[PDB]
Design an enzyme around this catalytic site. Structure first.
Site, PDB file in Angstrom:
ATOM      1  CB  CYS A 113      -1.032  -0.071   1.175  1.00  0.00           C
ATOM      2  SG  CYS A 113      -2.045  -1.529   1.031  1.00  0.00           S
ATOM      3  CB  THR A 114       4.035   2.131   1.737  1.00  0.00           C
ATOM      4  OG1 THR A 114       3.404   2.056   3.026  1.00  0.00           O
ATOM      5  CG2 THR A 114       5.026   3.287   1.734  1.00  0.00           C
TER       6      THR A 114
END
Ligand code: NA
Ligand code: NA
Length: 158
Positions: free
Chosen positions: A47-48
């Site tokens: 997600c980062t």
């Protein structure tokens, strides 16, 4: 006819809680393109990576007049912390009740652990200036994804 997904009318009027403390709605984005990317959890590796990839392309999305929104069911505070740590310059929707997720049908079930387990499936959508969902990506492969979304946007915006 150009839509790949149909949303309930009410979806466009749902108050969407953003990082930073304001709310938006999809109807409020009328007149410009909107990229909506759903991801399972703030501050995790994939997600980062995805967020940083969209962030790097923000000037290209600007060139096309488009805005981006990331979405997960994490809290506003979690989102604020994630944005600040990573330097994101676009907002994150805190979809705590999964109303937006359900509208886009991104809550998927998997038979695992002898249970029926529901969770956010990484998915992205392109919403036209007139509020039509004209492209979708599901079970998203993060590598190359933001580039692909930008390319598709450019092709559509013509
Ligand atoms: Na973080
Ligand atoms: Na729009």
């Amino acid at each position: 006819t150009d839509a790949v997904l149909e949303l309930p009318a009410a979806t466009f009027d749902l108050p969407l809680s953003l990082s930073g403390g304001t709310q938006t709605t999809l109807r409020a984005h009328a007149g410009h393109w909107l990229v909506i990317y759903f991801y399972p959890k703030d501050s995790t590796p994939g997600c980062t990576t995805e967020g940083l990839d969209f962030n790097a392309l923000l000037p290209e999305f600007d060139k096309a007049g488009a805005k981006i929104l990331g979405v997960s069911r994490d809290s506003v505070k979690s989102h604020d912390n994630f944005c600040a740590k990573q330097g994101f310059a676009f907002p994150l929707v805190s979809d705590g009740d999964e109303a937006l997720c359900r509208a886009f049908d991104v809550i998927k079930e998997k038979n695992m652990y002898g249970k029926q387990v529901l969770g956010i499936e990484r998915s992205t959508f392109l919403l036209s200036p007139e509020g039509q969902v004209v492209q979708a990506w599901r079970k998203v492969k993060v590598a190359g994804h933001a580039d692909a979304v930008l390319a598709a946007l450019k092709a559509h915006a013509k």
